[PDB]
Ligand binder design. Structure first.
Ligand SMILES: C[C@@H]1CC(=O)Nc2cc3cc(c2N1)/C=C/CCCN1CCCc2ccc(cc21)OCCNC3=O
Length: 115
């Protein structure tokens, strides 16, 4: 099966918007990690490939996903980085877990519709 970029954008954008609309839980994830500004300069000793909502938005808007699972992989990358770098007791970790629950509710029916 072939997916045109505008079909992916149409189908997937509501699931990305649902993540943005979690307030305050999306706030750690709305911008690319800047380790010096955030006071976490060792970040890229732990995480290699950063991901955030603004980068996913741009990739969706510019046709950078061939297949819907490439979009899922980037959201999962964003979550994995946060669950790796931050302690289980931390705000960022807990906010990530909230977003992950919302993401399932959004993406699971879409992925099944898209086949
Ligand atoms: C996903 C990304 C990277 C990560 O995996 N862990 C984080 C750690 C800190 C901060 C963030 C993280 N998210 C991003 C946070 C939200 C920014 C909210 N704002 C709003 C403006 C004022 C302010 C001041 C200090 C601050 C956050 C802060 O936090 C200092 C130490 N930062 C983290 O510990």
């Amino acid at each position: 099966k072939i997916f045109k970029p505008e079909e992916l954008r149409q189908a997937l954008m509501p699931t990305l918007e649902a993540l943005y609309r979690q307030d305050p839980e999306s706030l750690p994830f709305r911008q690319p990690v800047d380790p010096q500004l955030l006071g976490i300069p060792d970040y890229f000793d732990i995480v290699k490939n950063p991901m955030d909502l603004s980068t996913i938005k741009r990739k969706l808007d510019t046709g950078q996903y061939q297949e819907p699972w490439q979009y899922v992989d980037d959201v999962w990358l964003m979550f994995n980085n946060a669950w790796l770098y931050n302690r289980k007791t931390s705000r960022v970790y807990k906010f990530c877990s909230k977003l992950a629950e919302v993401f399932e509710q959004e993406i699971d029916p879409v992925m099944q519709s898209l086949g």
